Ligand binder design. Structure first.
Ligand SMILES: C[C@]12CCC(=O)C[C@@H]1CC[C@@H]1[C@@H]2CC[C@]2(C)[C@@H](O)CC[C@@H]12
Lengths: 12, 250
């Protein structure tokens, strides 16, 4: 969930 | 005049992804499945980046964005793999990655030969139907919007509009003759049938990977972090009937 959501939060 | 939607889909389509498979080791179940799992983890990064760049996708609630990606990745990845297999090896083998191409021996050793046969048939459909690259891209985009919770999303209304628009884009790009309206109708029918056919394949693979994760320590198969999380938290929602595909046909 961390790495997966991190791919959305980065440069949203 | 000159469009825009197709320009975007062409521009964001992911490039080559390698599995990192050591082709020196024998074709054992453990080695092959561990490499497929790593390929999944790697491709998931690209699926997220692709989806976030799709027209309208960022309009969805953030939790819905996460949800649709976590439910649809298997279908998306299988569909893309079918296309690679069609274009690279005329569907003779399964082109998972340049360093992970499955021949008959690997299909057997993977213990998912039956599922591989179904994936090869999917790949062959791209040839039988003479699917165009633009049809492929629009169909693939629509797969992202083809599986949701029975209870719905946080903002289901926005999702329903987005899906509608993606269906409209597919309808616009179908390879047919307008002078023969029957041809366009037949084509759209064929494409919606092809899209629906991805779902039972994805379901079989969801069942397989779930069962594999449960016994993974016993059979020495490694699952990376993102895969293990999604297969243990989201995949069971599908398997238990909480999350279902949206079919065109009944
Ligand atoms: C999505 C992947 C990996 C990406 C791809 O090209 C399609 C392929 C289909 C079978 C999946 C695999 C990822 C790992 C899985 C889920 C294994 O655990 C069992 C079935 C595998």
């Amino acid at each position: 969930h961390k790495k997966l959501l991190q791919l959305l939060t980065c440069s949203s | 005049s000159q469009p825009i939607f197709l320009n975007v889909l062409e521009a964001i389509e992911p490039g080559v992804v390698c599995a990192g498979h050591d082709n020196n080791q024998p074709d054992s179940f453990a080695a092959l499945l561990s490499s497929l799992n790593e390929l999944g983890e790697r491709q998931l990064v690209h699926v997220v980046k692709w989806a976030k760049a799709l027209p309208g996708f960022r309009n969805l609630h953030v939790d819905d964005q996460m949800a649709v990606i976590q439910y649809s990745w298997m279908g998306l990845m299988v569909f893309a793999m079918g296309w690679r297999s069609f274009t690279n090896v005329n569907s003779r083998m399964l082109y998972f990655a340049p360093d992970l191409v499955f021949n008959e021996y690997r299909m057997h050793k993977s213990r998912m030969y039956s599922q591989c046969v179904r994936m090869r048939h999917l790949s062959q459909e791209f040839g039988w139907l003479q699917i165009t690259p633009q049809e492929f891209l629009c169909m693939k985009a629509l797969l992202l919007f083809s599986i949701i919770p029975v209870d719905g999303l946080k903002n289901q209304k926005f999702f329903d509009e987005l899906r509608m628009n993606y269906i409209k884009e597919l309808d616009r790009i179908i390879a047919c003759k307008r002078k023969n309206p029957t041809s366009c109708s037949r084509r759209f029918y064929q494409l919606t049938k092809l899209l629906d056919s991805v779902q039972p394949i994805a379901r079989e693979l969801h069942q397989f990977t779930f069962d594999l994760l449960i016994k993974s320590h016993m059979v020495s198969v490694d699952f990376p972090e993102m895969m293990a999380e999604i297969i243990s938290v989201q995949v069971p929602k599908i398997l238990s009937g909480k999350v279902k595909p949206i079919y065109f046909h009944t």
